[PDB]
Structure formats: C-alpha cells, structure tokens
Amino acid sequence: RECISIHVGQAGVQIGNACWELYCLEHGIQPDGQMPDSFNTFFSETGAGKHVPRAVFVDLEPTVVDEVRTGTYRQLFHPEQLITGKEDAANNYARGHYTIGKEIVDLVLDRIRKLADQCTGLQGFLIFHSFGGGTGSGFTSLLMERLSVDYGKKSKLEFAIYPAPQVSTAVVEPYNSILTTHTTLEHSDCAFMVDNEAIYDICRRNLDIERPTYTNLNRLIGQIVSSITASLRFDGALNVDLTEFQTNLVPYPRIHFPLVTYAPVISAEKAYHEQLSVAEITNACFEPANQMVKCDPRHGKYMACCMLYRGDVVPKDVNAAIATIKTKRTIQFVDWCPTGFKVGINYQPPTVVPGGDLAKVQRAVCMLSNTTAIAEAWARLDHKFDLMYAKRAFVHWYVGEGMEEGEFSEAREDLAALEKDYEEVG
C-alpha cells in the first residue's frame, strides 16, 4: 500500500511543511532520514539508515521554496523532487492554465512516473492547495486533468482551502474560485473543503490563543491528514480503508464534498479539569460551533458521517453513543437512510508535536460528514462573482491570456447545476 503527496503553491508548501514534520515524529525518524516496519506507506528506504519521503514540492516562485532548502529539514527531501519556477502566476487563473501551465507541467509529470514506479499496490495521491491564488488554481487544475487521463480508476484526494465570504485578503478572488469548480467536480473522487475564518474561531474560543498566525492554522490541518491515514499505518479493532471509505460516504457521483471537524482540541491548563471520554467527545463533533467551514448544519439534513477514533476506545459504548444522538430530533438525517454511520476504531494514540498548541491525550476523534448544509458556501459566493461580471471588471487581464468571454458562462452554468443537485437530493 503506497501513497504520494503533491503540494502546490505557497499555501501547499506551507501546509505541506507542517505535515512532514508531523509524520517524522510519528515514526521516530530523524530529520536526517535515519530511525533510532509500517512507515513504507510514505517513506522510501535507501540501503541502510536512510529514509526519504514520497513528496513533490511544486511552485512557480523561488522564494517560498528557498525556505525549505535552507531550513532545518533540508536533508530529508531528495533535491530534485522539489521544483520551482521563474515567474509567478500574478494571481491569474488565465496564466495558470495556459501560458505558464504548459511550461512546467511536463517536468513534474516526469517525476510522478518515477515516484509511481516504486509503488506496488498504489492507492492514490494527496493534493494540498488553495482556491485563492493563481498558482494553486490554474496549475493544480492542470495536474488533475493530466493525472486523471493517465491513471483512470485509482482515486485522488485533494484538500482545498475555500475563500471566505467576509474575511478575505485579495481583490479578484471570486474569479478564480469559480473557474476551478469544473476540474474539481469531474476530476476528484473526494474533495475536502476547509475555510480560513473557522480555523480562527476554533483558536479563539476552544483553544484560547490570543493571536493565531499561519503557523498554528496549518498545524490543525496536519492533524486531520494524519488521522485519515492512520488506518493504513496501524492496526486496531475495526479498520476502514480509503476505498472502503468512499463507498460508505459519497451517495451519488455528484456529491463528494465532506465537511471535517476534529475533537478534542483543548489548552494545556483546561486539560486537567475535564474528563475526556468517548460518550462526550462524539457529541462535540456535531456542534455547529466546531465545524471547520462556516455553515449551519441546522439547515441541512445529513446522509452520511464517519467516526474515526484512535487511542483507548471499546466498541461497546460507541454503539450507545451513536444511538444516543439517533434519539435527538435536533440533529436531522435523511429519511431514506435508516442507518448513516461508519465506524473505524484504531489502537494507536495520537502524537502531540512539541512547539504546538495541543495537550497530550489518550483519545481523539475525527468526523467526516457529507451534509447538504454546504450548499450555501457556493450559492453565497456566486453572487459576488455575478456582481463583478455585470460590468466586466478585471476581465481585460484574463482575455489577453487566451480564455474567452463565455468561459464564465460554463463557470456559472457548472455551478448553477451543482446547487440543484444538492436540492434534488435534499
């Protein structure tokens, strides 16, 4: 069982940076690549006492990849796995797909084949990127178009960051976050959606940190990715696989946008007072004040959710805790789904990173619900992009790069159809 992770853009490299420090500590592997087993899913051996990851770093700017080349973790990554450009996308989807997309897309696609050669039972790829900028919108969408043709059946996972409705940092964000919607919809088997504001609220209220900067927000994302793949790396009472996961969750081909949430997240001092048991944590995952994207499940009806516990858990009570929520009419599920839970229980406790904002725990829960509440995160956005295109602002920048005037028609017609599907199933 083999898996390879791809990081795109500044956002991808930052999120990728936090993960690969996390993975090393999990398996006791030094930054030099020696271990003072089961790590082969992510790591490759070289003779004796050398471990190198199955990573590729992709970027169109030298500056934010020149950081990893000099940082503490320079000696882990194989030098040519780590690719840079010479001119940026200048926050354009138009330059991302067409003008600068085709000048590096071949170089990395050559390396994927070298990395896909050591694999023996390959599951799929892990993609980290964001919908804000031009590099991670145009170039990333270019890889899924190339990867889908070449491999076909085996699944691809990507972890997107959606632009906020209110707290956003760029000017032209709606243009790219609408044009990406085509390639995510027809070329991603399960698409994970994460927002930037909701990470802050979790930091303010639950985690009690005054000033969350980008160091902490990435460390929260790293914990989720470790939790999903802990089923491959370890063994426990009940096991859930990535192919086993897709079947239970995604109900129709057009609906693969799970919402993620994690528990427990708690401060160092607040850990001593509360008793963290299975029956109480599983209730926290369903709190609308803990969801990772600003949606209210109170207006949505669930049809799937997955519970992934790790640590000291027994299936006797997990039966009762799930049945407890089944009795609540506050939390609503679809009528044609009499049972709607997938349970996976693992035996290895989660590992806390030094320099982080989490306290050592015996149990942890990760929840993945495929709810229809998310329909608002796109319909609310599409008003912004529709507001822009009435007067055709900024369009002169994109037109000169090659894409035509109706390209936005498919951009909204694709999104218009997708909101209907969440209605029809709704």
Binding site: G121, D235, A237, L238, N239, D241, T243, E244, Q246, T247, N248, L249, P251, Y252, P253, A304, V314, P315, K316, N319, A323, D335, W336, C337, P338, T339, G340, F341, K342, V343
Partner: protein, 425 residues
C-alpha cells in the same frame, strides 16, 4: 467421520481463532502440536479435526481464507497461532471495501482457484468425511462475497454431503455500516438453497447476554467470540466422546429440519453464570433445562413467544440420568402447550454425552428451530426497501454489471422465504 474447517473474512478469523484455542485445551494438544493428556478417550477420535504429522505432532484441518493481508499478521502472531500450516493461509492483496459486487465478481474470481486447490487436498487426505463447516459474517463485503461463492462451488462438487454455516446476521440497533442492507439481502438469495444447516447470530443479542445474565461491564470482541465458539464446540461432542445416547450431524438434520427450506436455527447455551453468583446455585438437570427455553437467554434477536416452535434439540454433557432428561421434557411440553406446534407430537430431540467440560460437572446446548425467524427478515428488508427505492449508493455496485432483476429476485425470494414461515406457524 472427520470434518474440515473453512473460515472467511476478517470477522471469521476471530470467531475462528478462539475455536482452535478452546478445542486444543479440550483435546490436550499444546501450543506446538504436542500431546500431554490423561484420558485415552481423547485419542480415540482425535482425527476429527487433526491429521497426523511426523514427530508425534498434530496440525489442524483448517483452511483459512482472507482478502486483505492485515488480519493475517494478528492471527499468525497470536496465541495458538503457530498450529496452522503456512500453506493454509490464503489471502489476497487488494481488498473489498464493503462490496458484495467486488467480493463475488471482481476479486473473488481470481483468488478462488488457490483455496479450492487446498480444500481439494484436504478432501483426498481424509478417508471418509461427512461435511464442511464455515464461519463468516453476513454484513460485510468479503465474508458475504467470497463466502457465497465458495458455498456455490463446493455444493456442485459434493451434492451428497452435509454442509454447515455459522453466520452472523446484523441488526439495526447495532448498525455500523451505511450499506449493510445491500449486503444482507444479496447473500441470502443463495443460502436458501446451497446449504443444509444454517445458524443465525445477532451482535445485538450477544450484548444482552453479556450485560444482563453474565454481569460483564466491558464486552469486547474477546468475550463475544468466546460465547459463539462454545456453541460450535458443543454440536460435535457426539463425534468425539461416547455416551448413553448419541446424535451426530446427519441425525440432527433429519430429525429437526421438517421441510427443505426451513433450516435457520437459533443457538442457546446453559449454564451461563457470573463468577460471583456461581456459589449460590445447585448442580442438577432441572435448573439447566428451564434456562434453555428462556426467551431472555436465546442467542438471536427474536422472541420465540411471538410464535410456536416447530422442533428443537437439546444436547447434554456429563454423567446424567436418563429419566431426569426425558421426564422434564414432557413437563415443559404439557405445562407450556401453547408454544409448540400441535400436529407434531413430542417435538424434542435428545442426546447425552459422557465426558463433561473441563472444570465443570454439567452443561448443555439448545438448538431450537422456531417460527420466530420470520421477523428477522422483514426487519432487515425494510431497511433495504427504504434505500433501493431511491437508488442510493447503487452506482457503486452497478459498475460491476448487476441488473435490477438481481435485486427484485433477491426481494421476491426473500418474500418467498418469509411466506413459507407464516402458514406453518
């Protein structure tokens, strides 16, 4: 009269793991195939599950199956793991992902050749055998998909012998997977015809027995698999030890299956007592028999009081008295004349063995064929009609080519099965 063992799926292994742990202690075999017993009666019928090897060692007549490699490491490294022959561990590399479609068509088609080569080897080695026994769970993908395939292929080769399945049928109150109803419906279309004796077990009722009767505070899969294995070990006591009255597998099937389609049973075991309340009981047959028929101790999610028993069988162990067994059989029948079918006089089959369970004086097993199984099936199918009507999750299975006739045929014959139980109640 010896019988080979097949066990499939992730669930089948822990059910299968405890069986070989318990039965080695019964027959005195150590963890390395050596023998250190006392009674010569152990060696009289030893070859029923074991075959002779060089150096005075025995290895089991076990044929072990899997479709993912993770569960192999646990069973191999666990206690009594080295007993098995390495060639017997037959497992794939990809996985099923909780599908009946992949378990029968896509992945079961390739690995089926390897196992049938091994089971063919076990058949020629033995001189004159009677049956095969298979332990699996009816909710998953591999166990349902591969288990149903092997049963089909085995039956055609040997139409003249008896076949056993010890299945686990799921319940809504302990539901765990979003696609359970699709698995349970698609499989039973074949067990209605391709097996001779079928036992149904609910994970829901196993929790009732461990909570209430046994006073267990933390029921893990270590304990639940303990309960089932004692039922399997009990049915085949007459094959291995002498007694006043004997009853083997063919004796039960003829005496207690009234019609060809009515072969779905309900386990039950007694005594089941806590480690603190065991000093406050007697040692007598009457206390055993009144516990078998208890609607609170039976091993499925059915109340027999919603129907009338067709036939039963009670299998006893220990030095016992032959009047005290049959005299109390009539006490139940006449004092409870409402709960038994009227046109079957003396509905009860009897058997007594000599050698008791280790550490005990007496024990017994209840196998009662009831008409109350008719409720287990609409309860599951109602789950299925609420989903397939709107075509949820159906695209995952349809990619392998099944047609809606398959679902309707699954629904029609399960209605055909449910119909058969109602008129004869």
């Amino acid at each position: 009269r010896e019988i080979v063992h097949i066990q499939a799926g992730q669930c089948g292994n822990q059910i299968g793991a405890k069986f070989w742990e318990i039965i080695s202690d019964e027959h005195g075999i150590d963890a390395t195939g050596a023998y250190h017993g006392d009674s010569d009666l152990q060696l009289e019928r030893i070859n029923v599950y074991y075959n002779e090897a060089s150096g005075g060692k025995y290895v089991p007549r076990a044929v072990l199956v899997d479709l993912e490699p993770g569960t192999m490491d646990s069973v191999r490294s666990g206690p009594f793991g080295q007993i098995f022959r390495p060639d017997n561990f037959v497992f794939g590399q990809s996985g099923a992902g909780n599908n009946w479609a992949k378990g029968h068509y896509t992945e079961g088609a390739e690995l089926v050749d390897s196992v049938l080569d091994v089971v063919r080897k076990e058949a020629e080695s033995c001189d004159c055998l009677q049956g095969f026994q298979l332990t699996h769970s009816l909710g998953g993908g591999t166990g349902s998909g591969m288990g149903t395939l092997l049963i089909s292929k085995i039956r055609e080769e040997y139409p003249d012998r008896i076949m056993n399945t010890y299945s686990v049928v799921p319940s809504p109150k302990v539901s765990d997977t979003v696609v359970e109803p699709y698995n349970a419906t698609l499989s039973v279309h074949q067990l209605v015809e391709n097996t001779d004796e079928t036992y149904c077990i609910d994970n829901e009722a196993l929790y009732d027995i461990c909570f209430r009767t046994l006073k267990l505070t933390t029921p893990t899969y270590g304990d639940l698999n303990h309960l089932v294995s004692l039922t399997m070990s009990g049915v085949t006591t007459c094959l291995r030890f002498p007694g006043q009255l004997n009853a083997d597998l063919r004796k039960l099937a003829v005496n207690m299956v009234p019609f060809p389609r009515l072969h779905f049973f309900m386990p039950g075991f007694a005594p089941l007592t806590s480690r603190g309340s065991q000093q406050y009981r007697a040692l007598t047959v009457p206390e055993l028999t009144q516990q078998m028929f208890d609607a609170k101790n039976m091993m499925a999610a059915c109340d027999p009081r919603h129907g009338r028993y067709l036939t039963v069988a009670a299998i006893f162990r220990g030095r016992m008295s032959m009047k005290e067994v049959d005299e109390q059989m009539l006490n139940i029948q006449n004092k409870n004349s409402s709960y038994f079918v009227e046109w079957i006089p003396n509905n009860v089959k009897t058997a007594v063995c000599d050698i008791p369970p280790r550490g005990l004086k007496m024990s017994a097993t209840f196998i009662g064929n009831s008409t109350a199984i008719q409720e287990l099936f609409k309860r599951i199918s109602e789950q299925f009609t609420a989903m397939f009507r709107r075509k949820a999750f159906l695209h995952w299975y349809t990619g392998e080519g099944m047609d809606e006739m398959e679902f309707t045929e699954a629904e029609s014959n399960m209605n055909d099965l449910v119909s058969e139980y109602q008129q004869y109640q």
